[PDB]
Design an enzyme around this catalytic site. Structure first.
Site, short mmCIF file in Angstrom:
data_model
loop_
_atom_site.label_atom_id
_atom_site.label_comp_id
_atom_site.label_asym_id
_atom_site.label_seq_id
_atom_site.Cartn_x
_atom_site.Cartn_y
_atom_site.Cartn_z
N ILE A 71 38.93 36.92 41.46
CA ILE A 71 37.84 36.06 41.01
C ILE A 71 38.45 34.86 40.28
O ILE A 71 39.27 35.03 39.39
CB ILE A 71 36.86 36.84 40.11
N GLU A 160 37.44 45.36 43.37
CA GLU A 160 38.15 46.64 43.45
C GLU A 160 37.46 47.61 44.39
O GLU A 160 38.13 48.36 45.11
CB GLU A 160 38.34 47.27 42.06
N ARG A 163 38.39 46.69 47.86
CA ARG A 163 39.76 47.12 48.17
C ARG A 163 39.92 48.60 48.46
O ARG A 163 40.79 48.99 49.25
CB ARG A 163 40.70 46.75 47.03
N1 LIG Z 1 41.89 35.27 38.30
C1 LIG Z 1 41.92 36.61 38.47
C2 LIG Z 1 43.03 37.32 38.05
C3 LIG Z 1 43.05 38.70 38.22
N2 LIG Z 1 42.02 39.34 38.80
C4 LIG Z 1 42.07 40.81 38.97
O1 LIG Z 1 43.23 41.32 38.31
C5 LIG Z 1 44.28 41.63 39.25
C6 LIG Z 1 45.53 40.76 39.09
O2 LIG Z 1 46.08 40.84 37.78
P1 LIG Z 1 45.96 42.20 36.91
O3 LIG Z 1 46.96 43.20 37.45
O4 LIG Z 1 44.51 42.55 36.72
O5 LIG Z 1 46.46 41.76 35.46
P2 LIG Z 1 47.42 42.68 34.56
O6 LIG Z 1 47.37 42.07 33.19
O7 LIG Z 1 48.74 42.82 35.29
O8 LIG Z 1 46.65 44.10 34.52
P3 LIG Z 1 47.26 45.39 33.77
O9 LIG Z 1 48.24 44.83 32.76
O10 LIG Z 1 46.06 46.07 33.13
O11 LIG Z 1 47.89 46.17 34.91
C7 LIG Z 1 43.71 41.47 40.63
O12 LIG Z 1 44.04 42.61 41.43
C8 LIG Z 1 42.23 41.25 40.42
O13 LIG Z 1 41.52 42.48 40.66
C9 LIG Z 1 40.90 38.59 39.22
O14 LIG Z 1 39.91 39.12 39.76
N3 LIG Z 1 40.88 37.24 39.04
#
Ligand SMILES: Nc1ccn([C@@H]2O[C@H](COP(=O)(O)OP(=O)(O)OP(=O)(O)O)[C@@H](O)[C@H]2O)c(=O)n1
Ligand SMILES: *[C@@H]1O[C@H](CO)[C@@H](O)[C@H](O)[C@H]1NC(C)=O
Length: 246
Positions: A71, A160, A163
């Site tokens: 998103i 999610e 997916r």
């Molecule tokens: N602009 C964005 C950024 C991230 N995401 C969501 O977050 C994920 C990518 O980064 P994410 O792994 O969520 O961030 P982290 O901080 O790495 O999460 P965590 O530390 O909890 O694993 C994607 O799969 C998506 O579902 C999104 O929807 N839109």
């Protein structure tokens, strides 16, 4: 575009929406029968618009990057909102340009940053169709702390679920009662990139993962996924992040 209306929503209509969402994501190749998301898309074609309506019929439009299901931002009435990250700033060049003003949210879209802004891990945030109704309503009027929580709900109940069939099913089970996500749900979310990569790496490796993926299963048991015969690959995952984006 795709649409979903919370008014009169049930497990079936939610399932139709998640099907629509999946089908709106372009692919030219399947890998082990799973759609492989494209390496890149140029211009406005990169962004899918999801029209979401709360129970009262108020609406936001959410912009989704079709290469990774991330998103980027959303439009609420005449104000656009984008994550504080380069991918979303780029998206803001193409979507919601007629908004009377643009607000950049005070965080990026990644789970870690959203959880910090929200003041809680999504382990503790109920999700479900009622929670999605709340999320939409929250996002209608700017409140960055509340929005972080709403976006965590939104991401999980749209992207999610697209997916992973298991996550779609979890939301369908929460059609009229919210519940915090299962540990398996959290695990799958965290492992989507890893799984996508290993399924692709398995192509020239007789279906065997180069590196095992550790998941938590339905019973709360931590398990190793080592090859494409696993139910996660055959059953569950519905979209692959291209290795060129990993
Ligand atoms: N602009 C964005 C950024 C991230 N995401 C969501 O977050 C994920 C990518 O980064 P994410 O792994 O969520 O961030 P982290 O901080 O790495 O999460 P965590 O530390 O909890 O694993 C994607 O799969 C998506 O579902 C999104 O929807 N839109
Ligand atoms: C592949 O995964 C299956 C199912 O999880 C498992 O039983 C088996 O030991 C694995 N086989 C190989 C060759 O890695």
């Amino acid at each position: 575009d795709v649409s979903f209306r919370l008014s009169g929503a049930d497990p079936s209509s939610y399932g139709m929406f998640i099907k629509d969402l999946r089908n709106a994501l372009p692919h030219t190749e399947k890998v082990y029968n799973i759609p492989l998301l494209l390496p890149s898309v140029s211009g406005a074609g990169r962004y899918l618009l999801m029209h979401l309506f709360n129970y009262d019929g108020n609406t936001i439009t959410v912009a989704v990057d079709v290469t990774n299901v991330y998103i980027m931002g959303y439009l609420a009435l005449t104000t656009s909102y984008f994550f504080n990250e380069p991918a979303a700033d780029l998206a803001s060049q193409y979507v919601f340009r007629s908004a009377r003003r643009k607000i950049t949210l005070p965080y990026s879209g990644n789970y870690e940053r959203l959880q910090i802004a929200a003041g809680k891990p999504r382990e503790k945030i109920p999700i479900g169709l009622p929670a999605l109704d709340t999320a939409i309503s929250t996002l209608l009027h700017y409140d960055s702390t509340a929005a972080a929580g709403a976006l965590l709900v939104l991401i999980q109940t749209t992207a999610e679920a697209a997916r992973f069939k298991y996550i779609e099913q979890q939301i369908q089970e929460r059609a009229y009662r919210d519940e915090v996500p299962s540990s398996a749900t959290i695990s799958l979310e965290n492992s989507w990139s890893g799984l996508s990569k290993q399924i692709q790496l398995a192509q020239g490796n007789n279906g065997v993962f180069r590196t095992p993926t550790v998941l938590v299963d339905s019973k709360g048991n931590r398990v190793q996924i080592t090859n494409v015969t696993s139910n996660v690959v055959t059953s569950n995952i519905q979209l692959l992040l291209n290795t060129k984006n990993i």
